Paper text:
Analysis of the Complex TWO dataset resulted in structures representing the consequent forward translocation of Polγ relative to the conformation observed in Structure II by one base pair (bp) (Structure III, “Mismatch Locking” complex) and by two bp (Structures IV, V and VI, “Guide Loop Engagement” complex). Structures IV-VI reveal the same location of the mismatched base of the primer relative to the catalytic sites but show notable changes in protein conformation. Structures IV–VI show similar overall conformations. The most notable difference between these conformations is the gradual motion of the G-loop, accompanied by the straightening of the thumb and rotation of the palm subdomain of the Polγ_A subunit, suggesting an essential role of these elements in the proofreading process. Compared to Structure III, the palm of Polγ_A gradually rotates relative to its thumb subdomain and Polγ_B2 by 13°−26°, assuming its most “open” conformation and changing the trajectory of DNA by 15° within the catalytic subunit in Structure VI. The transition to the G-loop Engagement complex aligns the 3′ end of the mismatched primer with the entrance to the narrow channel leading to the exo site. In the Backtracking Initiation complex, Polγ has translocated 1 bp backward as compared to the G-loop Engagement complex observed in Structure VI.
DNA polymerase (DNAP) can correct errors in DNA during replication by proofreading, a process critical for cell viability. Here, we present an ensemble of nine high-resolution structures representing human [name] DNA polymerase Gamma, Polγ, captured during consecutive proofreading steps. The exonuclease (exo) site is located ~35 Å away from the polymerase (pol) site, with no direct path between them. Altogether, our findings suggest a conserved ‘bolt-action’ mechanism of proofreading based on iterative cycles of DNAP translocation without dissociation from the DNA, facilitating primer transfer between catalytic sites.
Author numbering:
A (entry chain A): 78 to 249, 262 to 316, 340 to 495, 534 to 626, 738 to 997, 1050 to 1232
B (entry chain B): 64 to 160, 170 to 355, 362 to 485
C (entry chain C): 66 to 355, 368 to 485
The structure:
Amino acid sequence: MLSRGLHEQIFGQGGEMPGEAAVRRSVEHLQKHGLWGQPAVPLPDVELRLPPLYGDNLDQHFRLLAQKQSLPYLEAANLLLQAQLPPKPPAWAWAEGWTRYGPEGEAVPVAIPEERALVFAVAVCLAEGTCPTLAVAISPSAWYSWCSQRLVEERYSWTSQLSPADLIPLEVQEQLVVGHNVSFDRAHIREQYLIQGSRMRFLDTMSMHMAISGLSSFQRSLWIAAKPAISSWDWLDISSVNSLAEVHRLYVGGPPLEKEPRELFVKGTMKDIRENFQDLMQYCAQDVWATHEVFQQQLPLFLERCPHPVTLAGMLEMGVSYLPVNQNWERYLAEAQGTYEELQREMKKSLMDLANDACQLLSGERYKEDPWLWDLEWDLQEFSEEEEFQQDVMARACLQKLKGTTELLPKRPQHLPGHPGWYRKLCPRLDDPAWTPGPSLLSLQMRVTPKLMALTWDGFPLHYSERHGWGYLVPGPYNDVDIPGCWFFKLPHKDGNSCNVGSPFAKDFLPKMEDGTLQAGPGGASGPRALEINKMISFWRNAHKRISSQMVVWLPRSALPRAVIRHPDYDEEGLYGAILPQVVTAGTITRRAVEPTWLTASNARPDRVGSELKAMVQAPPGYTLVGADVDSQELWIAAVLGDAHFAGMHGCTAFGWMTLQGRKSRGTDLHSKTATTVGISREHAKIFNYGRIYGAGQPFAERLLMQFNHRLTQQEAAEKAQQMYAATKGLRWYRLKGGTESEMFNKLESIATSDIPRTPVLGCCISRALEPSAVQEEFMTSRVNWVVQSSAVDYLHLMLVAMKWLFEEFAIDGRFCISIHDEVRYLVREEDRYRAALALQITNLLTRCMFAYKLGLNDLPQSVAFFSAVDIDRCLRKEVTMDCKTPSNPTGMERRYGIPQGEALDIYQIIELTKGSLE
Amino acid sequence: EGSEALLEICQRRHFLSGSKQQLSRDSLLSGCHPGFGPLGVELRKNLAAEWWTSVVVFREQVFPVDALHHKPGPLLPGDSAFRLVSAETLREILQDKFLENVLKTSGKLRENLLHGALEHYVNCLDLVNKRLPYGLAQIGVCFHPVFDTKQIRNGVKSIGEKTEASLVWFTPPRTSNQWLDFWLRHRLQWWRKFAMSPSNFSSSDCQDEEGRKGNKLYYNFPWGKELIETLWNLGDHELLHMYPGNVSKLHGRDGRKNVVPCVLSVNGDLDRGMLAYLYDSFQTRKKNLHRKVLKLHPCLAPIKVALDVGRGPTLELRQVCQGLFNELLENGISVWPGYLETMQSSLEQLYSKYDEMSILFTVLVTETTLENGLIHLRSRDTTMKEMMHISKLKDFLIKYISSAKNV
Amino acid sequence: SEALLEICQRRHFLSGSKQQLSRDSLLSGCHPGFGPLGVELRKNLAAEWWTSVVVFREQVFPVDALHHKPGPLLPGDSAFRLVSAETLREILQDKELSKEQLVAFLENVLKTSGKLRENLLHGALEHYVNCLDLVNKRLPYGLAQIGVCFHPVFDTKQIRNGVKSIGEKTEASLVWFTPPRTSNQWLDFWLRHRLQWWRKFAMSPSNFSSSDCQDEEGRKGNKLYYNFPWGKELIETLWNLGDHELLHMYPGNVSKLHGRDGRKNVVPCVLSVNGDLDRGMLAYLYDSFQHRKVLKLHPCLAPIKVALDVGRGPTLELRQVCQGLFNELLENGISVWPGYLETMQSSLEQLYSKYDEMSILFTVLVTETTLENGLIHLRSRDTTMKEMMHISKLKDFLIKYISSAKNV
RNA sequence: GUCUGCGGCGCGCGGGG
DNA sequence: TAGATCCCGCGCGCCGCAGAC
């Protein structure tokens, strides 16, 4: 205990050989930079009887756990690897259900494939929803095919759980399934949507490929271009672009796979699918065969590149995810769509009103002096007592018909003469489009919308003359930065923003609507309303397609278990379904899961219509989500690696000292506490630090500072090298980059060029594309980023395997890990939820200790030994206490409040009966 | 300041409201104003017509109903708040011997109109063959008691008149929540329809003291939000109370079962909605455009087209407008009978007068109209002129109104 | 003659229980209101009156008059429908009484609180002040308004001593300010126009009659009675009140209530025309009544023009076309009865009998032939004769028919 | 013979995830 | 950092088909 803050352990011998020299070095390092003297605040000590361990050390324990988890599926993988299949059958059957093709092509109807290993691929037609249409698989025995009951002509109206295929025997044992983008194929498998867990596990060849010679983003931007500028291209042969054809070409020697020109499944209708049944079956079987060949060529390579069994166990576990919806998904979609449609209509009305009001400037040639509409054409071209009186031109008038010599242009040929040219162009035709009265056909994307609104600063034309929004936009030929406008145009210069559109920038205007010199101003009636309308619309505008069209399968009543039944929340015409995220277990050069609509840093953010997407993921009755977010994951990993490189003490390097001791509130934390004080902006320094620990330079820092706020080059990171001077004082010689400042980056650089597995914890190899040994290259920033991201991935794998071990050892009805931006969630029955929390805390105690076990350390600080808070909620949200903006309130839905727990959960045990609560 | 004060100029002036130099928002919201001008009456009638078209029409199982302006005397529980005074001051009992002093068993003016709808529900039940989903709508004037709460010079409580449209909808209890939500959304759409700034209209949820949940709609006036439309779940209890002798007669039929319908009342104030539309239509500082104009929606503006003549060498030939004006009267297009004042009025002055009067289009007939008939047409929304032709006027205006009716 | 109360009550035409309306009180304002068809007939008649009088004259404007009267220092002799005139707790006429200090003259008695109006002439005179500016000094012009007026009733079968009752009558009132010269000309013109207007929608215009009467206050008066079988009633009154009524208000000042007629300043003379719309509907309904139970009412005044029904045929695939035609015929503004959704397969003969009792102009029958080629059956109310017709050709015909109804 | 208001191909730019 | 490329959108010319002066 104590000794600058450590934890109490019941595993591991005495150890304790830090070295007096190490102590002196740590003390003399902490004397400078930070302050050595900090009494701090000791934390309470926790005593608990952990479950029995395996092996001699913790590494052996995790190895044994992962081997026990993976061997039943490694057997099936090896069976598939050593199997040989006959040529494809000549003609594929037509009967509904599953048909097995014995040798010579003998079709026999079979209920299901009784096989322990398949290579799977599914075809879906975009015409009739997202229901699967055809499927074919291969086992060591023979081929199988499935027609989907496609041939019958009967309406079904979608929303059916029996529609997809079937691959699990009733059993009244492992059945690995390999595929390319296997999540897509499993989305149409059925029995994966069941709330009760499934023993089948999936393997993905793209995840195998991203790990084995995967391609980065910048590198992929040049690998197609060759299907400081100078560099070495020796990595082309080993890298591909993850497409099935390219992957088959790279890993398997053979002719290129033919690509179907018709593409009836993606662009076609059901009739073409029926007509081209044999060709589509042949194409699908060819894809299956290519996937099988790639898997055979990759499995030994994968096992060689990722020797630690924990990596494979974690990859297997992360492939099974579960997002229950509970019939609030479609209601949310309807509400969001309605909000979007009415907000868009109001925006259109506002723009029409602005256009109408703008016409008055020509009544006295007042547009000539308007800075906004000075350059518009503003052109107008022409080109018996009472009965007797009643019969007086009663209907129109006699001979009132015009000879039409002057009136020879009918309808659009004479479109609103007299009106300004721009207003004329905006308006529709008189007859064909129903005339939609007003300056219709107006939208934000039109150039006309600028200069009808917004335009803060001095001059904001936004004219499309290879400069977009022109402006010097700073103090100090004429009207270069002046307000009134009407420049001489002797020579337009792109001053101020010298980079022009060349620099990437970002969506740096939507953040910037809050002041940011971006506002309507003189209008005061409808100008600003449109800006806020765009603010609330922008998210759902370019994301409704992804959020919508998500495959949801609703279980029947008989499918639900007794847990859902016999609950206060039950029936009420209730629909219970789930959404498989369709996430690749690895999608980047670093083995982090990639998903554009679920694995994103978004939450219920006010003044947004499509927000609260993460919400509405509601567990069924009798179930809840136990989740936890790793407290400063990447920063902690970098700090512990740096200190371990420096000495055995955790706080020796002065960076882990700040991480462990610094606090967000009343503390000198790097996030929102210290970096902002030295810097300008507040809460933007988090991104600054996360980008600097991943590798960057003075130009990138200067560009990021410009992005945060508008300053001249000197005030940017050109004369402001202090942050680089401090923090990472790299390029230091006469010492034999290492140290000389508060950050150690030397260990990351050494790992980059080491050519070993390069992952200090679990020894997962880097992609062959980026290996310095395989190819000489100077893409250092990618490798230093990869090491930390892969360390985070291995952390996640360790948590997943530990959680599965704990859930299988004790009767905890919980499964279906979900990973989102380093946060983990588990769906568990309510009566064991506390246990699921406690076990989860133990995971953080064990996983971190594994990170401590390697790199030559044997102690873990008490601060990081446990999760800050563990949330036992009924829905997914950033914080346990959150609300929604666009709806009336969270209470509109059945959104109760969770329990952070943390310290209370320590008072129980992990056995089934805790505090006599059972029975 | 120009907020609620500049509007009152060109409001009483152009006879959109009674002219008594009141200029009191409290008086208007209270309903004690002497009355509305002819243009105010026309605008209120247009708003009522739009409400009727969007509620009774394009909606099945909706029928009209009329409620009396006065209620019967006998069987009248309760008493007026100000009338109830018996604490002291009873020295003079010299009077010899209904009569009495506790409400005298006398009549009472109606404060609410949905009571008549509830009473007539039993007679209107047979209209829909006892089908549970159906409603009754009615627009009527109600008198309410209002006191300034300041001084004693006012004395007895003042009385204010206000026109409201109330729809009582009977729906199955099971679907009551979703039907109420749909009705609230429809009313929000309608109020945002014909709205120059729909954001000013807002909705909120409220909990009744009994436990019933309802929705309240407000318009954000320059001084503060004012209630305009209220949706309440009546709870069906008072309908049972009105008929405690036997409830076996009132049970409606839903699907193949018999149940007592749930009642939702949606009551909107046409007097306060019209003022909201007036305020919203009107826009100030560093505007550089001036030209104050009430930009009411074309679908409910009081006056559509204004006729005039100009520089007519032979004024006797102006009868070309006559008849054409009459033609415009056919098919229900309102016209301002101009070409009568014939004073030396500048064109800009007349255009400003028509703009403040909320006239969609201004039609001018010139000497060049007798042959190759072209009439100068000016638009309210954009001060721009057209030529067009006589034969294309009528249908075009109808088209415009129709094209305004549905976005 | 007899049994008209029962048939009127049936078919939802009149709102009330059996024998509640009775023969008496029906003319009187205080009787159970009309049914939804009656309200629609009230709404159509008011629209027709507005078209005939207000817009077609280009000199008559709407006016607004509150139902209540503040009555500041009001005289102690008047109608006194509700002397208290406060919200709730109206003391009715309260003849005599108020002798004690409680409920006395100094506050809330003598009509200081106010009264309930009985005619819209007073509101017209009040609004004259700004209406004169509205017309820009033009003297000959009028104000029209349809609104409810409250009257006192008495001798109701003398069942019990009368305690008075509030009779509400929806009256259309036109107050015409005209120059003193040629006032009789305007009076005669308005009388003739009103007679023609009331004779226009009547199947038997000979029933309507006119008479003249003289009063000391009024220079000349005219009355329309309609000559009801039980006796001569009063359906419309026309009176020449004179300028003294206007002079009664605004006693102070001068040269303010006068206008400019023929470039001559003159004090206007007021002519008041009052028509009981409720009496007008009852007379028209009697005229429609005649030997089957069918009422021959004018097409323009028909509360419902066309109706939809389905006879046999498949249950499905007919509601879609019916709803589409419903939308199309509602878009153009002709109301249609949603009779195609009625279940239980009501008898065709009973359906036709009820529809004729409805007074609906036409009955539309849709069968599988409509699905095959869009052909339906159209049945007329008066001739009771069925004809084959195309689905797309109804709309124009109906409006064409109404044009024939509108055109004389 | 004009000068256009109605169709099909290319081309520039951008933004996104 | 970790950027992402077809795609969707908004403009343009070039090539024609009609049509009144």
